[model samples]
Target: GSSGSSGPVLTQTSEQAPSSAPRDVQARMLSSTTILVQWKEPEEPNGQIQGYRVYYTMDPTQHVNNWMKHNVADSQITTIGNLVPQKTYSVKVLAFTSIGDGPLSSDIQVITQTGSGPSSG
Candidate 1:
């Protein structure tokens, strides 16, 4: 004789938006004084994601001073121009969903290869 117990296994579902790999990040040194930056939207746009949070800092190790953030809607691409010449900058992007903001994407470090322009000077 053998005795056996059977029960239905229940799987838990997460209300949070699904994690997605970072999308279309590109940086180009436009002339010696300017840099162009652009990126695409995440794979999952469940409407929960309202927009994107762009973070930039001159020092990759320092997260305090000279830091800037931009909030862009889901349908917009971020463009940053007139960057300081010969300076290194680090940029990180995060997606904000109704649930909350997702983890930061990979940090992109770029160095401006040019000098100050008419506007910056």
Candidate 2:
């Protein structure tokens, strides 16, 4: 399910933005088909916290071009499923506002197997 709406008056300056990106973004492989991503709010949500985006790809360098814009309209927790087994992916989060998306957080790698987490851990 996806939905977006318009918001308040606009600002035309580069400074009217969040000071930093999302905090402590961490993920856990719930199963071979699903992953749970959790994060904290920005140190300074200079503007309203609108929503979040999850970008992932089999190739880390191609991650920027491929992504999943996840939003429960202010919800923080999200679960993604139906990943390809035996494949690997890199994931990251981006917090966005009326202004635009901020920077990317630290990256995480998940390799799918037969309903298992990291093979070494």
Candidate 3:
């Protein structure tokens, strides 16, 4: 029986892509093969932030597949494990929306802590 339906259908659902990147991106050394990455939302999120992305690398220079990306759901922090000890990693963060991803925040350097542990006589 539905022939002519020009009713106001769904026009828009989500907001526009964010223009600002994440803030206060901190890379804390957790353990030998683990690091804690924490960050705050953008100062001016143009739209709803759907998730976050984290990129890390050991190379100080720039080239090749040195950087690896890890997409995470809605959250303020994440833990990166299974990393090589005694390796210095440069990390970057970005806030993403349904439309697109924002520019990466400032690079943060984290040198994994090193210790043997337990002294015996």
TM-score of each: 0.66, 0.70, 0.73
Q: Where is model 1 more than 4 Å wrong at Cα? A: 1-15, 44-47, 64-66, 114-121
RMSD, one per candidate, in order: 10.2, 8.5, 8.6
lDDT-wise, the better of 1 and 2 is 2
Candidate 3 lowest-lDDT run of ten: 5-14
- Mind giving the per-residue lDDT tens digits that candidate 1 earns over 1-121? 6644344553633457536645777666767755666777667554466777777766567662347765588754666776687788887776767876566678788887754445453
Task: Output the TM-score of candidate 1.
Answer: 0.66
Please tell me which predicted candidate would have the highest lDDT against the true structure.
Answer: 3
Better of 1 and 3 by lDDT: 3
Error of 1 at 102 (Å): 0.5
Ordered by TM-score, highest first, the candidates read: 3, 2, 1
Candidate 3: tens digits of C-alpha lDDT, residues 1-121? 8755556665544477778888878877757898889889987676778888888777658752356767689888999888888778888888888888788887778888854446489
Give each model's clash number. Answer: 1, 0, 0
Overall lDDT per candidate, in order of appearance: 0.67, 0.71, 0.78
- Give the candidate order by descending lDDT: 3, 2, 1
For model 3, how many clashes? 0
Where is the poorest 10-residue window by lDDT in model 2?
4-13
Model 2 lDDT per residue over 17-116, tens place: 5667778787777777788888888876768878877877666665476554455456777887877878887777877788766786877786765454
